[PDB]
PDB file of C-alpha atoms and ligand atoms in Angstrom:
ATOM      1  CA  UNK N   1     -16.622 -41.990  -8.091  1.00 43.19           C
ATOM      2  CA  UNK N   2     -17.231 -40.422 -11.505  1.00 42.83           C
ATOM      3  CA  UNK N   3     -19.467 -37.411 -10.885  1.00 42.86           C
ATOM      4  CA  UNK N   4     -21.935 -36.058 -13.337  1.00 46.36           C
ATOM      5  CA  UNK N   5     -21.201 -32.450 -14.287  1.00 44.79           C
ATOM      6  CA  UNK N   6     -24.162 -30.945 -12.417  1.00 44.57           C
ATOM      7  CA  UNK N   7     -23.726 -33.421  -9.565  1.00 40.65           C
ATOM      8  CA  UNK N   8     -20.201 -32.127  -9.020  1.00 39.67           C
ATOM      9  CA  UNK N   9     -21.407 -28.528  -9.379  1.00 38.35           C
ATOM     10  CA  UNK N  10     -23.939 -29.133  -6.598  1.00 41.21           C
ATOM     11  CA  UNK N  11     -21.400 -30.723  -4.250  1.00 39.16           C
ATOM     12  CA  UNK N  12     -18.890 -27.924  -4.857  1.00 39.89           C
ATOM     13  CA  UNK N  13     -21.604 -25.343  -4.220  1.00 41.61           C
ATOM     14  CA  UNK N  14     -22.718 -27.079  -1.007  1.00 42.63           C
ATOM     15  CA  UNK N  15     -19.100 -27.097   0.238  1.00 41.75           C
ATOM     16  CA  UNK N  16     -18.818 -23.335  -0.392  1.00 43.34           C
ATOM     17  CA  UNK N  17     -16.815 -22.986  -3.625  1.00 44.17           C
ATOM     18  CA  UNK N  18     -19.277 -20.794  -5.565  1.00 45.70           C
ATOM     19  CA  UNK N  19     -17.580 -17.359  -5.574  1.00 45.93           C
ATOM     20  CA  UNK N  20     -14.865 -18.561  -3.179  1.00 46.67           C
ATOM     21  CA  UNK N  21     -12.074 -15.983  -3.569  1.00 44.41           C
ATOM     22  CA  UNK N  22     -14.249 -14.538  -6.311  1.00 46.29           C
ATOM     23  CA  UNK N  23     -14.300 -17.625  -8.582  1.00 45.58           C
ATOM     24  CA  UNK N  24     -17.780 -18.493  -9.801  1.00 44.03           C
ATOM     25  CA  UNK N  25     -18.872 -22.122  -9.727  1.00 43.22           C
ATOM     26  CA  UNK N  26     -18.297 -22.692 -13.452  1.00 42.02           C
ATOM     27  CA  UNK N  27     -14.582 -22.065 -12.960  1.00 41.32           C
ATOM     28  CA  UNK N  28     -14.379 -24.929 -10.444  1.00 41.77           C
ATOM     29  CA  UNK N  29     -16.400 -27.288 -12.645  1.00 41.69           C
ATOM     30  CA  UNK N  30     -14.284 -26.451 -15.711  1.00 39.46           C
ATOM     31  CA  UNK N  31     -11.113 -27.048 -13.714  1.00 39.80           C
ATOM     32  CA  UNK N  32     -12.351 -30.425 -12.472  1.00 43.15           C
ATOM     33  CA  UNK N  33     -13.415 -31.451 -15.978  1.00 43.64           C
ATOM     34  CA  UNK N  34      -9.939 -30.929 -17.415  1.00 42.31           C
ATOM     35  CA  UNK N  35      -8.011 -32.008 -14.319  1.00 38.92           C
ATOM     36  CA  UNK N  36      -9.811 -35.269 -13.534  1.00 42.42           C
ATOM     37  CA  UNK N  37     -12.735 -35.739 -15.932  1.00 41.88           C
ATOM     38  CA  UNK N  38     -14.898 -35.545 -12.781  1.00 41.65           C
ATOM     39  CA  UNK N  39     -13.295 -38.749 -11.393  1.00 41.72           C
ATOM     40  CA  UNK N  40     -12.414 -38.683  -7.695  1.00 39.81           C
ATOM     41  CA  UNK N  41      -9.966 -41.569  -8.181  1.00 40.61           C
ATOM     42  CA  UNK N  42      -7.784 -39.761 -10.752  1.00 39.21           C
ATOM     43  CA  UNK N  43      -4.033 -39.808 -10.036  1.00 39.82           C
ATOM     44  CA  UNK N  44      -1.307 -38.469 -12.327  1.00 43.39           C
ATOM     45  CA  UNK N  45       2.437 -38.196 -11.869  1.00 42.50           C
ATOM     46  CA  UNK N  46       3.826 -34.696 -12.432  1.00 42.11           C
ATOM     47  CA  UNK N  47       7.113 -33.888 -14.104  1.00 44.89           C
ATOM     48  CA  UNK N  48       8.717 -33.030 -10.784  1.00 40.17           C
ATOM     49  CA  UNK N  49       7.978 -36.514  -9.336  1.00 37.34           C
ATOM     50  CA  UNK N  50       5.075 -35.346  -7.260  1.00 40.67           C
ATOM     51  CA  UNK N  51       1.640 -36.739  -7.987  1.00 37.72           C
ATOM     52  CA  UNK N  52      -1.691 -34.999  -8.395  1.00 37.51           C
ATOM     53  CA  UNK N  53      -4.708 -36.535  -6.644  1.00 39.79           C
ATOM     54  CA  UNK N  54      -8.453 -36.416  -6.938  1.00 39.24           C
ATOM     55  CA  UNK N  55     -11.181 -34.379  -8.562  1.00 40.26           C
ATOM     56  CA  UNK N  56      -8.996 -31.221  -8.524  1.00 38.33           C
ATOM     57  CA  UNK N  57      -5.600 -32.901  -8.960  1.00 42.53           C
ATOM     58  CA  UNK N  58      -4.030 -31.615  -5.758  1.00 38.93           C
ATOM     59  CA  UNK N  59      -0.303 -32.176  -5.590  1.00 38.53           C
ATOM     60  CA  UNK N  60       1.817 -34.061  -3.122  1.00 36.85           C
ATOM     61  CA  UNK N  61       4.753 -31.556  -3.114  1.00 36.13           C
ATOM     62  CA  UNK N  62       2.872 -28.877  -1.180  1.00 36.22           C
ATOM     63  CA  UNK N  63      -0.597 -29.982  -0.142  1.00 37.67           C
ATOM     64  CA  UNK N  64      -0.932 -33.652   0.886  1.00 37.50           C
ATOM     65  CA  UNK N  65       1.328 -36.465   2.031  1.00 36.56           C
ATOM     66  CA  UNK N  66       1.818 -39.489  -0.215  1.00 36.11           C
ATOM     67  CA  UNK N  67       5.029 -40.787   1.382  1.00 36.66           C
ATOM     68  CA  UNK N  68       7.039 -40.666  -1.851  1.00 35.55           C
ATOM     69  CA  UNK N  69       7.584 -36.998  -2.683  1.00 33.99           C
ATOM     70  CA  UNK N  70      10.755 -35.087  -1.611  1.00 34.11           C
ATOM     71  CA  UNK N  71      10.027 -31.754   0.053  1.00 32.08           C
ATOM     72  CA  UNK N  72       6.393 -32.547   0.892  1.00 32.66           C
ATOM     73  CA  UNK N  73       4.996 -29.794   3.118  1.00 33.78           C
ATOM     74  CA  UNK N  74       1.532 -31.369   3.587  1.00 35.09           C
ATOM     75  CA  UNK N  75      -0.089 -27.962   4.006  1.00 35.24           C
ATOM     76  CA  UNK N  76      -3.594 -29.475   3.965  1.00 36.83           C
ATOM     77  CA  UNK N  77      -2.568 -31.960   6.713  1.00 40.67           C
ATOM     78  CA  UNK N  78      -3.991 -35.011   4.964  1.00 41.71           C
ATOM     79  CA  UNK N  79      -2.849 -38.221   3.276  1.00 37.37           C
ATOM     80  CA  UNK N  80      -3.194 -37.803  -0.465  1.00 33.33           C
ATOM     81  CA  UNK N  81      -5.425 -40.919  -0.506  1.00 33.11           C
ATOM     82  CA  UNK N  82      -8.076 -38.851   1.325  1.00 35.58           C
ATOM     83  CA  UNK N  83      -8.355 -36.845  -1.881  1.00 37.34           C
ATOM     84  CA  UNK N  84      -9.684 -39.906  -3.786  1.00 34.27           C
ATOM     85  CA  UNK N  85     -12.840 -40.503  -1.731  1.00 33.57           C
ATOM     86  CA  UNK N  86     -16.330 -40.386  -3.156  1.00 34.06           C
ATOM     87  CA  UNK N  87     -16.899 -37.579  -0.598  1.00 33.34           C
ATOM     88  CA  UNK N  88     -15.179 -34.442  -1.894  1.00 34.11           C
ATOM     89  CA  UNK N  89     -14.952 -32.612   1.445  1.00 31.23           C
ATOM     90  CA  UNK N  90     -11.184 -33.041   1.829  1.00 33.74           C
ATOM     91  CA  UNK N  91     -10.493 -31.961  -1.751  1.00 36.19           C
ATOM     92  CA  UNK N  92     -12.655 -28.849  -1.349  1.00 33.85           C
ATOM     93  CA  UNK N  93     -11.142 -27.850   1.979  1.00 34.59           C
ATOM     94  CA  UNK N  94      -7.667 -28.191   0.497  1.00 31.66           C
ATOM     95  CA  UNK N  95      -8.574 -26.391  -2.751  1.00 31.43           C
ATOM     96  CA  UNK N  96      -9.737 -23.452  -0.635  1.00 29.86           C
ATOM     97  CA  UNK N  97      -6.190 -23.203   0.729  1.00 28.26           C
ATOM     98  CA  UNK N  98      -4.596 -23.628  -2.719  1.00 28.18           C
ATOM     99  CA  UNK N  99      -6.644 -20.795  -4.272  1.00 26.50           C
ATOM    100  CA  UNK N 100      -5.617 -18.564  -1.365  1.00 27.68           C
ATOM    101  CA  UNK N 101      -1.854 -19.011  -1.942  1.00 25.46           C
ATOM    102  CA  UNK N 102      -1.484 -15.809  -3.989  1.00 25.58           C
ATOM    103  CA  UNK N 103      -2.070 -16.740  -7.636  1.00 22.86           C
ATOM    104  CA  UNK N 104      -5.747 -17.654  -7.390  1.00 25.50           C
ATOM    105  CA  UNK N 105      -6.857 -20.389  -9.754  1.00 25.48           C
ATOM    106  CA  UNK N 106      -3.642 -20.080 -11.787  1.00 25.60           C
ATOM    107  CA  UNK N 107      -2.367 -22.708  -9.342  1.00 26.37           C
ATOM    108  CA  UNK N 108      -4.246 -25.193 -11.557  1.00 30.06           C
ATOM    109  CA  UNK N 109      -2.340 -25.267 -14.839  1.00 28.90           C
ATOM    110  CA  UNK N 110      -5.342 -26.788 -16.611  1.00 29.47           C
ATOM    111  CA  UNK N 111      -7.570 -23.955 -15.385  1.00 26.75           C
ATOM    112  CA  UNK N 112      -5.132 -21.358 -16.701  1.00 26.94           C
ATOM    113  CA  UNK N 113      -4.667 -23.107 -20.053  1.00 29.16           C
ATOM    114  CA  UNK N 114      -8.211 -24.362 -20.685  1.00 33.35           C
ATOM    115  CA  UNK N 115     -10.728 -22.403 -18.587  1.00 35.11           C
ATOM    116  CA  UNK N 116      -9.362 -18.909 -17.959  1.00 33.11           C
ATOM    117  CA  UNK N 117     -10.730 -16.462 -20.513  1.00 29.56           C
ATOM    118  CA  UNK N 118     -13.486 -18.832 -21.672  1.00 29.60           C
ATOM    119  CA  UNK N 119     -17.252 -18.968 -21.131  1.00 31.81           C
ATOM    120  CA  UNK N 120     -16.980 -20.954 -17.912  1.00 27.89           C
ATOM    121  CA  UNK N 121     -20.671 -20.470 -17.052  1.00 30.18           C
ATOM    122  CA  UNK N 122     -21.335 -23.031 -19.790  1.00 31.44           C
ATOM    123  CA  UNK N 123     -20.135 -25.660 -17.305  1.00 33.20           C
ATOM    124  CA  UNK N 124     -23.170 -25.100 -15.049  1.00 36.00           C
ATOM    125  CA  UNK N 125     -25.729 -24.533 -17.811  1.00 39.00           C
ATOM    126  CA  UNK N 126     -28.647 -26.935 -17.489  1.00 38.27           C
ATOM    127  CA  UNK N 127     -27.970 -27.618 -13.824  1.00 35.84           C
ATOM    128  CA  UNK N 128     -30.771 -27.466 -11.281  1.00 35.98           C
ATOM    129  CA  UNK N 129     -28.736 -25.844  -8.535  1.00 36.02           C
TER     130      UNK N 129
HETATM  131 CL1   CL L 201     -27.591 -39.253  -6.208  1.00 37.08          CL
HETATM  132 CL1   CL L 202      -7.831 -13.959  -7.948  1.00 36.31          CL
END
């Protein structure tokens, strides 16, 4: 599913991400924009041979099992395919663990390089939320 910007903002808010670990909703929308272009089906191989999955590009080395990544810890206890559903519940529940690992949203390289230090509230401007 390719979400509209405000559609994804509303689903992330409903699932509890607004101000989760202190990160306002625009941070999560900005991250999803640059990670997946709002597309739940996005998959991308990483340099290390892991793969990133879903709207928030969650990786198979630590967080989900894809059957093809050495060292997989599957800390979210899910097949990586569950992260590609039109329903974002699994991605949100896992992202809540990722952002709790110690480095906050710096766990998402695209957030650090493209959202951090910017006007992230722009990503929810115009939304009826
Ligand atoms: Cl709808
Ligand atoms: Cl933090």
